[PDB]
Amino acid sequence: MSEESQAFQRQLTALIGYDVTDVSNVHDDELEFTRRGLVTPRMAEVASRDPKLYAMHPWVTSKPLPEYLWKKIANNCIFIVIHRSTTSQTIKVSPDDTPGAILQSFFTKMEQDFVLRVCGRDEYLVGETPIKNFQWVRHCLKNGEEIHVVLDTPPDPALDEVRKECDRKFRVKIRGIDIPVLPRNTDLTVFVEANIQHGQQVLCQRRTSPKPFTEEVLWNVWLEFSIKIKDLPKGALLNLQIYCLLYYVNLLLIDHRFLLRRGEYVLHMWQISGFNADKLTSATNPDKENSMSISILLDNEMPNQLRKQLEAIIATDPLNPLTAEDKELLWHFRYESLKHPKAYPKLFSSVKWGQQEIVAKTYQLLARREVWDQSALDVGLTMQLLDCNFSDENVRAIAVQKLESLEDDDVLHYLLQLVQAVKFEPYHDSALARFLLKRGLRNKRIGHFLFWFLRSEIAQSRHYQQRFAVILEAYLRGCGTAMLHDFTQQVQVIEMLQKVTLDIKSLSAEKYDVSSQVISQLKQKLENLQNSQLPESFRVPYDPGLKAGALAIEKCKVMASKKKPLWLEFKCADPTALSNETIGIIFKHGDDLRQDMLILQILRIMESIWETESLDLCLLPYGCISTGDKIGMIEIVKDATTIAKIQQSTVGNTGAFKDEVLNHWLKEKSPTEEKFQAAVERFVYSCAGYCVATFVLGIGDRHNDNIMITETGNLFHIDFGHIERVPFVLTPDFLFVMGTSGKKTSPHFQKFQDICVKAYLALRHHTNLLIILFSMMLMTGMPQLTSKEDIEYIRDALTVGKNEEDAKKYFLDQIEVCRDKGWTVQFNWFLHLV
Ligand SMILES: Cc1cc2ncccc2cc1Nc1ncc2c(n1)n([C@@H]1CNC[C@H]1F)c(=O)n2C
Numbered sequence: 001m002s003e004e005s006q007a008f009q010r011q012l013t014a015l016i017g018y019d020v021t022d023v024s025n026v027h028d029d030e031l032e033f034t035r036r037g038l039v040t041p042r043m044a045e046v047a048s049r050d051p052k053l054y055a056m057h058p059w060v061t062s063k064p065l066p067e068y069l070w071k072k073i074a075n076n077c078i079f080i081v082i083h084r085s086t087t088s089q090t091i092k093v094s095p096d097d098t099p100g101a102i103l104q105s106f107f108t109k110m111e112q113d114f115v116l117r118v119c120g121r122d123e124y125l126v127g128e129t130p131i132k133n134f135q136w137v138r139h140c141l142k143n144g145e146e147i148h149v150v151l152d153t154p155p156d157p158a159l160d161e162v163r164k165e166c167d168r169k170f171r172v173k174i175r176g177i178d179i180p181v182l183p184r185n186t187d188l189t190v191f192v193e194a195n196i197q198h199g200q201q202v203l204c205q206r207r208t209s210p211k212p213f214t215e216e217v218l219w220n221v222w223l224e225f226s227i228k229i230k231d232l233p234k235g236a237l238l239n240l241q242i243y244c245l246l247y248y249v250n251l252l253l254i255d256h257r258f259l260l261r262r263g264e265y266v267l268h269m270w271q272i273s274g275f276n277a278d279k280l281t282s283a284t285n286p287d288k289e290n291s292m293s294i295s296i297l298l299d300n301e302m303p304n305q306l307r308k309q310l311e312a313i314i315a316t317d318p319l320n321p322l323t324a325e326d327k328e329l330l331w332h333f334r335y336e337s338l339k340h341p342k343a344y345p346k347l348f349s350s351v352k353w354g355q356q357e358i359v360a361k362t363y364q365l366l367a368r369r370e371v372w373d374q375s376a377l378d379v380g381l382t383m384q385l386l387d388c389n390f391s392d393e394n395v396r397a398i399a400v401q402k403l404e405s406l407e408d409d410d411v412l413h414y415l416l417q418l419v420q421a422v423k424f425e426p427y428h429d430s431a432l433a434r435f436l437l438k439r440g441l442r443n444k445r446i447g448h449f450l451f452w453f454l455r456s457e458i459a460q461s462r463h464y465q466q467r468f469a470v471i472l473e474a475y476l477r478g479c480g481t482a483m484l485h486d487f488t489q490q491v492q493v494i495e496m497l498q499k500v501t502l503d504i505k506s507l508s509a510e511k512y513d514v515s516s517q518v519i520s521q522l523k524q525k526l527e528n529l530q531n532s533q534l535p536e537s538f539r540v541p542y543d544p545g546l547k548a549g550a551l552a553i554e555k556c557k558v559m560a561s562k563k564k565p566l567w568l569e570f571k572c573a574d575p576t577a578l579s580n581e582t583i584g585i586i587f588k589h590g591d592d593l594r595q596d597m598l599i600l601q602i603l604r605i606m607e608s609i610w611e612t613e614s615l616d617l618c619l620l621p622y623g624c625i626s627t628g629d630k631i632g633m634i635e636i637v638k639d640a641t642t643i644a645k646i647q648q649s650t651v652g653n654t655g656a657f658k659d660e661v662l663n664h665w666l667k668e669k670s671p672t673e674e675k676f677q678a679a680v681e682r683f684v685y686s687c688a689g690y691c692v693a694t695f696v697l698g699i700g701d702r703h704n705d706n707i708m709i710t711e712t713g714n715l716f717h718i719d720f721g722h723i724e725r726v727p728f729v730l731t732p733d734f735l736f737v738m739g740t741s742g743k744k745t746s747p748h749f750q751k752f753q754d755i756c757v758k759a760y761l762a763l764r765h766h767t768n769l770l771i772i773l774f775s776m777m778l779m780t781g782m783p784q785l786t787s788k789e790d791i792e793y794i795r796d797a798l799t800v801g802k803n804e805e806d807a808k809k810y811f812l813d814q815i816e817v818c819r820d821k822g823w824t825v826q827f828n829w830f831l832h833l834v
Contacts, residue, residue: 051157067614120577160480173297176218203354235426380769420780542623549573563590584636591721617689620716669711679713
């Protein structure tokens, strides 16, 4: 390699936040074979992409325009304001006119080398797609904004330049376990449990005789299993556990080269806190000075009434468990089951993966996928096949195949969930890791989010940082030096600000309030960075369209919270931006922003589910991005306050609540009565939409402090790092805005109940998609969630197996529960914080 080729790898390590050219925490070469095996699909995608559309990354949608956005179109006319230097003129356009077709009409109504770019953003309107199919144009319609675009030169694709390049039973010898230290107080006991697993299913289990837990425990015991060597499926894990359950460690029995794992291994294990993705990891603990280590050794046509039972089994939810009777029925009528794509997760669960001949029969089954391949993509079904219950490479590949049909608009909606799904792959190089890699290198928008998602996990997950860092490096080596440049500027800014956030917290106390001495201390620290090595301009990580310029120090502050975060304001680095408004970012340390990311992503999916049934529930999924360990960025919502501060305005630090304050704050932050009516209108949909969503997600009972509202009536829920009770927040202040004064029906209450049940019914139509996203959220995002109890809440919330009116009743009852209590639960929320 070249001297400069090492400076490139050094840059990559600072970007990724982990050194992938590291061999200190491996007992094989799978990560090096994965860096090697990922050069091929990167090169093929870098080569197949059109440089022009790659540089301009048009954000497009093939979905139809909704009935609510059509009602905004007055006489089949859409106006675009085209700007140039100091002048501009409006253009009467048709929803089908492609960017080129309307550029030709601008040049006629009065050089042919300029493209259309949205003012202030790095967002372009290019390609053979109608204007109504550009997401920025749909955003302007929905929020009543005007379309502003500037006539300028298309970015040079030369900036996107990529740098050149046996029939015997299986047995295992347990030698012993060693730990450096353990306190001299409790004289405990210990044993080793070896499991052969595949898709969380335990094929076989052997334990050791229990010996006294000391700093070194030798057994020298051969543990013979019943499963023959040939019967071992690919992806089978040898899960070794220490119970007194304090420690665990996995080792793949079939390596990446299809070779059976043989020889001597001294594995550094993980410790338990106090089921989840972290438990399936092939990674070993990097902490060799403090961790426990086990040392092992390997020296090896159907009848009508049965059709009804089958069809009923196929018609159950993802969490309905399969009896042995059910699995035998599905396997025997294997070919009838194959005619129903909905039965695929259940049919592949019925397979006896520890039987070679039965796996071979399943592979024969998969070879007749005329029904599967010609079926409409069901993301819920496809995700169902990519969770912890599926470890077969070919079962997982039919699902990844179905994802290939997804447009970039939809890949963005499921990206964080698909990135977390890599945690369930037996091997580092997988069809899913390749699909993500390929889709990232193809769209800049997806590559940016892919970068931040992969980077959030590398920074706070030792269990999967090695794997994700190899996937990130493969992406980072194909995005091009324009993207590599932006990521560098973004990484520097977040690191400098993360140092300042952690320094400010230690200075004060989580027991006290912010002082003048802490705010002046922050201003002197920010002034030091600005005129020194703080990048001249960085791209907002949660809004890559925006380029934040220099800080606005005289408006930055330390928030009067308990996790003392930084409220930062930046100037816009685009002189073409239509407004002089700053870019506000909140920098916080002390909560898991990954849990907030996951909720906001479900909230965006729920918004698209309502978009299908022509429903706009006015949700405000704000920007939130996890940048490292318990730290990250959150969007500042302009002209917005909390429901608590509206209550403390009338009476401070209580307790005391009044029903009439929310409707008085709205009539105040309104210039005209027309704008005030629009606020009550926006509150009817945003309140209804948040009531529905928050209930379904089990995060319905929050303090009014974590619920904000904008000066334009837009109510929104915030801070999901958290999770007598209530289903959702419908306090008597919200109800007063809607014209109801407890046990009385007003026109806006009829409207709220109407949209509520219609939004609820609309979500119930995607029950399996919501169940599957939720169950995956709990395994890949929380400390630990029980695989049969914690999830069951969402089945009860979405009322599985009930008719469309008995469920309507259940939700209408939940409306009445929050009205009976009123402010009863809210008072307790203030006694709990004192
Ligand atoms: C959206 C958003 C979500 C968050 N989730 C978790 C943690 C912090 C968050 C901050 C957010 N952003 C925001 N923009 C503006 C604000 C604001 N919070 N606040 C309250 C102070 N921090 C908490 C806010 F209730 C205001 O008083 N103003 C003027």
